[PDB]
Amino acid sequence: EIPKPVAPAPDILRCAYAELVVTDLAKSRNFYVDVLGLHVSYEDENQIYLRSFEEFIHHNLVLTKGPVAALKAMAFRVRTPEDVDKAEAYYQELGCRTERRKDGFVKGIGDALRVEDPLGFPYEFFFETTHVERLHMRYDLYSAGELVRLDHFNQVTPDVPRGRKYLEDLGFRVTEDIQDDEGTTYAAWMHRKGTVCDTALTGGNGPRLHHVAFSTHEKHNIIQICDKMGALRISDRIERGPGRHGVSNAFYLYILDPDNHRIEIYTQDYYTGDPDNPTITWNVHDNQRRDWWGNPVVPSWYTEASKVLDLDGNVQEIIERTDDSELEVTIGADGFSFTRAGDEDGSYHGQASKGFKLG
């Protein structure tokens, strides 16, 4: 269990960017720029720096060429320069490996701290960043599938309560979670910026990065991403969706980049900024908790996720989840889910909803 430091937590504003390692920079560029329409802030033979339509900081995504595709850093902006020092003192008191660079780890970020956090995740904290042209009224550039904001990260970790307590001490507040009647926690969402989440924990073998999520303005923007992927004859890279989430109430889609990094496209969750924001707990067997329309969750969504790196750029070793598996207890041969609690009609036993079993 992770103790609460005596040192004050840094004041975290929001998720700000991820740095993903990618194996073929040109094919990743085709996906993020040509298919998804993200905006280039800088690029060279080694890296592509990308931002969403409404962003003013330098980037939301950095694609770094390297030998092994993986999450290199998930970065949170903090409220003041001094909060970077606070983060350093906090993680040092946790006994975590830290690395400070006064001039940043990536272009367009200044003074920055990277840490191997207690769950094995590479986090960055920074304040200083190079401001760029905010493209939010550049409707001459606007795509039918325009990605407007970075919304959140989602992390796979074997012990959700242990992770949750740690993120609570860091100032994140839980908005929604998924549990069962026998006291197991399968997932939790938690926030700083007043949306449903900034980062989220998914119970599973880890550390691994489940996804990075971008917003659109409207639902039709997400439908267009699907339609465009069908036109490009890359519908096999649509993993799951589109749907309505139970948890978050957002309209969603999950797609896969060329190195199998999962991207969620997301819109229209709700305000969580009040400090007594009501938490919402879903039962793991509730077949409307993940897709509100009861569509089945593809098993890859539960099993696959990206490697993460340590601060030397080596892959973090995986620790196996010992708590019950969400896949197994819902859609596996011994699983079940319901539409109405207590009702056998519209319940599924040993298979997924809507007439499928696991492939």
Looking up tokens 């860091």 gives 170
- Give whichever of 41 and 155 is closer to Fe ion, judged by the CB atom: 155
User: Cα(151)–Cα(198) distance, rounded to whole angstroms?
Assistant: 7
CB of 343 to Fe ion, least distance (A): 29
List residues bridging with 124 in a β-sheet.
75, 114
152 binds Cl ion (CB under 5 A): no
CB 22 within 8 A of CB 66: yes
Tokens 């790196």 label which residue? 309
For the CB of residue 359, give the shortest distance to its own copies in the complex, in Å: 5
**Is 328 annotated among the ligand-binding residues?**
no
Which H or E run includes 65? strand 61-65
Q: How many residues bind Cl ion (CB under 5 A)?
A: 1
Find the helix or strand (DSSP H, E) in which 263 lies. Answer: strand 262-267
134, 56 contact by CB (below 8 A) = yes
58 marked as part of a ligand binding site? no
290 binds, among Cl ion, Ca ion, its own copies, none (CB under 5 to 8 A by kind): Cl ion
217 assigned to a ligand binding site: no
Q: Least Å distance between CB 44 and its own copies?
A: 26
Is the Cβ–Cβ distance between 270 and 249 less than 8 Å?
A: yes
Identity of the residue, 28 or 306, whose beta carbon is nearer to Cl ion in the bound complex: 306
Residues 179-198 that bind its own copies (CB under 8 A): 193-194
Residue 358 interacts with, from Fe ion, its own copies, Cl ion, none (CB under 5-8 Å by kind):
its own copies
- What residues from 286 to 315 belong to the interface with Cl ion (CB under 5 A)? 290
Q: How far is the CB of 208 from Fe ion (least distance, A)?
A: 14
Binding pattern to Cl ion, positions 253-292, x when CB under 5 A? -------------------------------------x--
Annotated binding residues for Ca(2+), as ranges? 181-182
Annotated binding residues for Fe(3+), as ranges? 152, 211, 264
Kindly list the residues in this chain that would bind Fe ion in the complex (CB under 5 A): 154, 213, 264
